[PDB]
Design brief:
The structure is cut from a larger assembly and holds 2 copies of chain A. Chain A is mainly α and 48 residues long. Chain A is 23% helix and 0% strand. The PDB classes it as virus.
C-alpha cells in the first residue's frame, strides 16, 4: 500500500539507449541504424 | 611448442580477413588466393610482370 507522502521528484538512470522517449529518438532512425548493422550478415529465408 | 604468431607462416590479421570479410562467399576464396603470395625481392618479379 503506497502511503500518503508529500510529492517529491526522483530520477532513474535510463540504463540502455532504447528508453529515450520516442518523440526525441524517432523510429526510422533506429530502423536505419539496424539496417546499417544488417550489412552482409545473416538473414533468415522468406519461407521461414 | 606448436609455433608463434611472430614465427608462423600465417598471422592473426590473415584470419581477421576471413572472419570479417562479409563478402559474396565466392570471392573470399579468390581473396585468400592473393592473400597467399609471398613478398620478397624475387616474388615481385613474378607478380608485377
Amino acid at each position: 500500500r503506497p502511503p500518503e507522502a508529500m510529492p517529491t521528484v526522483n530520477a532513474t538512470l535510463r540504463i540502455i539507449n532504447g528508453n529515450i522517449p520516442v518523440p526525441l529518438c524517432p523510429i526510422s532512425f533506429r530502423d536505419c541504424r539496424g539496417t546499417q548493422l544488417g550489412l552482409g550478415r545473416h538473414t533468415m529465408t522468406p519461407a521461414t | 611448442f606448436l609455433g608463434a604468431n611472430h614465427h608462423a607462416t600465417i598471422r592473426q590479421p590473415v584470419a581477421y580477413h576471413v572472419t570479417h570479410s562479409k563478402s559474396d562467399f565466392n570471392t573470399l576464396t579468390y581473396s585468400l588466393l592473393g592473400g597467399y603470395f609471398k613478398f620478397t625481392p624475387i616474388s615481385l618479379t613474378h607478380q608485377l610482370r
